[PDB]
């Protein structure tokens, strides 16, 4: 009855540190952090539990980060790509010599992620069980007319604050800005192709152009999810709250709203961090422009 | 691997400390849990994730950790609290 629960992106917001975000493994830990809470914030006795429910979710999102204990040294060696590529040290060190080196093995990282995926137990699934367990521990009468609290708590204390934060940063403008930056760097590439060709760091520009193009497509993809531009009627929360319904319906519709916040905050956390990385290496594109001493 | 002397049975008044020694490859990287044993009757969980309360169990019990040292720390003893209290932790080096 209750219908319970595709890329993987890598991130270097700063130059020096790297993390990855496994898209299924974040929506999951989001779904059941937006379910465990819903249950306890319906019932009065369970208002006591929210310290423990918080500290549970905290300690799951920490054991998860302990997987990044040995997907770390190879990550750091992957970072030493930037050492060889963009800042050749002491000015003296010199074509697809670094493109191959121990440097193709972005796949080495992707391996080590999948090497410790299901392996090492099931810290995901833990969140499923606990969120479901606390969803079982419910009361009210469960007659024809049950109370619609629960959802309204979580909305106005977690959701409604963040929706304003996103609408304030009009993403439609953000995309069109990023498009134009990419367009101009492509046009300059067209011309630099037609002109130059020695000690060729145009290939670096081609490479960084390529990298920033896919990163754009991801941010573009996430932004479309966050604001679709064909909508349920954007209302949904209003349909849920300030009413009474039968036990079956409300339980489905808790799980309904529990799903939305999973995928929403997934894409929106990613979008924000990807945007910080785009303009980290848009400034590194502009560092090469600062190396046009001519 | 872990160590623990048997004494949870003297109750004039105050809290109580159960210390727990260990090593790098066990306490140092892994999350500790704690259990109470009423003699000749099923054991019960109090603390998991180093310090978190099971649904029903009192806050008087509390776990802790500092490097290669952990401790269970009860506060406000009772007749019920006189028992045997054991811990649970994993050891990466010997795998068990």
């Amino acid at each position, epitope marked *: 009855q209750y219908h319970f629960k595709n890329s993987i992106d890598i991130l270097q917001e700063k130059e020096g540190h790297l993390d990855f975000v496994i898209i299924p493994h974040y929506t999951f830990l989001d779904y059941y952090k937006h379910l465990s809470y819903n249950s306890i914030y319906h019932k009065s006795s369970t208002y006591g539990k929210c310290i423990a429910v918080d500290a*549970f979710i905290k300690k799951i999102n920490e054991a998860y980060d302990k997987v990044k204990s040995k997907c770390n040294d190879i990550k750091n060696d992957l970072i030493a790509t930037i050492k060889k590529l963009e800042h050749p040290y002491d000015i003296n060190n010199k074509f697809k010599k670094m493109m191959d080196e121990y440097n193709t093995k972005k796949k080495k990282l992707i391996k080590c992620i999948k090497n410790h995926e299901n392996d090492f137990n*099931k*810290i995901c*699934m833990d969140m499923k069980n*606990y969120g479901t367990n606390l969803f079982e521990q419910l009361s009210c009468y469960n007659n024809n007319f049950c109370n619609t609290n629960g959802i309204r708590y979580h909305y106005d204390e977690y959701i409604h604050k963040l929706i304003l934060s996103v609408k304030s940063k009009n993403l439609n403008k953000d995309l069109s800005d990023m498009t134009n930056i990419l367009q101009q760097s492509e046009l300059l590439l067209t011309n630099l192709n037609k002109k130059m060709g020695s000690y060729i760091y145009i290939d670096t520009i081609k490479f960084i152009h390529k990298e920033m193009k896919h990163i754009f497509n991801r941010i573009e993809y996430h932004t479309k999810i966050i604001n679709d531009k064909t909508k349920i009627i954007q209302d949904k929360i209003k349909l849920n709250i300030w009413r009474t319904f039968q036990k079956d319906e409300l339980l489905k519709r808790i799980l309904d709203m529990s799903n939305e916040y999973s995928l929403f905050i997934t894409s929106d956390h990613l979008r924000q961090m990807l945007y910080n990385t785009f303009y980290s290496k848009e400034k590194h594109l502009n560092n090469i422009f600062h190396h046009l001493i001519y | 691997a872990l160590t623990q002397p048997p004494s949870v049975s003297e109750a004039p008044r105050r809290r109580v400390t159960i210390y727990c020694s260990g090593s790098s490859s066990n306490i140092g990287n*892994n999350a500790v*849990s704690w259990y109470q044993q009423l003699p000749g009757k*099923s054991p019960k969980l109090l603390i998991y994730f180093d310090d978190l309360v099971t649904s029903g169990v009192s806050d008087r019990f509390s776990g802790s950790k500092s490097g290669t040292s952990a401790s269970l720390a009860i506060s406000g003893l009772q007749s019920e609290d006189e028992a045997d209290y054991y811990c649970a932790a994993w050891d990466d080096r010997l*795998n*068990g």
Partner: nanobody
Amino acid sequence: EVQLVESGGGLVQPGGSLRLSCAASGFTFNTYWMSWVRQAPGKGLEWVANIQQDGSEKDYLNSVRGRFTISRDNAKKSLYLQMNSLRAEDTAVYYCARDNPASAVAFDVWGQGAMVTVSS
């Protein structure tokens, strides 16, 4: 209902076969981790083994390694523990431990227990 019902367990001569069991209901057995824990008379607790929701991972201690065999049928909600080449150190009450929602070292609940004594 919080049910962990042991079946079997008894006495067999050194180097015997003995298969322990459990049953459960209410809490959906397939979705959660199980374990085994043992306690010898006049001795404290000792972890035996751990299993997965689909029996992907299996793990044991460092003495009965290869001897014991943890298994489960998740259609009938039933843990097992085939224990071959039995020794006398293996004298214990074998509790069908279940682990908590939170995967770790974490015996959520404990069954009544199966007395397994090993002697001539």
